Amino acid sequence: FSSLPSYAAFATAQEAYEQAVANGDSEVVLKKLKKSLNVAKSEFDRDAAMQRKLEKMADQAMTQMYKQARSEDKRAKVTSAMQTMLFTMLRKLDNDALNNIINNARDGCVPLNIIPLTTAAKLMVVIPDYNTYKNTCDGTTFTYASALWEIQQVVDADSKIVQLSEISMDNSPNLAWPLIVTALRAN
C-alpha cells in the first residue's frame, strides 16, 4: 500500500527521524520525533489492512455475481445440451443395431411403433424411396435393427395393397411411394 498520502507522510517522518538518530543527538529531539512519527505510523497501518479487506471483499462479490449469471445461463439451454450429450454418448457406445437404426432414420426409414423383442408381434416402418427398399428388402425377408423379419403386407399412401412382385426398378415410379411394411420377427 504505497499509493496513499498517509504512506508519504509516514515515509518522510521515518526518513527524517532515521537521519537525525544516525547523526546522533539528545533525548528531547528523539522524543519529539517519535511523538510526531507514531501518529503517522498508525495512520498508515490502519489503511494498510482496510484496503486489503476491501479488495478481497470486492473480489468475492464479483465471484458470486459471475456464479449466479453462469447458473442462470446454464439452466436455459438444457434441451439442446441434453440432445447433444445423448448423441455423443450414442456415438461412443458403438453398437451395430443402434448404428443401423440411426442411419436408417437419418436416411428416412423410421419405425411407427415400439420395436418388439418377442418372436412375434408386428413392426411397421416407412420406406420413402426405391433405394432404401433395394438395400433392406430383398426377396421376402426384411433386415432391420440387426435382425431378420418376414414381409406380409405392403400399403401405399392411397392405402391400396401392393404385391411384392410389382416393385421393380422401372415398374415402381408410378406409385405412391411412402410404403408401409408390416413384418414379424423371424426366429
Binding site: 455423443t88 450414442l90 457406445l93 437404426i101 442411419n103 423410421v110 419405425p111
Partner: protein, 78 residues
Amino acid sequence: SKMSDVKCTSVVLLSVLQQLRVESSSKLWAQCVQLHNDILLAKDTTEAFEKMVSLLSVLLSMQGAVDINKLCEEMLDN
C-alpha cells in the same frame, strides 16, 4: 465399462424423452419407464442392449421432435 455406459446413456435418453412432453400419453410413458427401470437393474450386457434398442425406437418414431441429420452433422452420431 460397457454396462455403466449403457446405463448412463439410458438415463440421458429418458431425460430427453421426458423433455419432449411424452408423459402426456400414459401408455407410452409407462412403457418407457418400465424399460428404463429394467435397464438399470440388468446384470448382463445383451438384455440391456435390446431394451436400449426398444427405448431408442420410441424417440426415433417421432417425426417433428428433433433433427436426426443436424444432430449427426455436428461431429456427433454417425
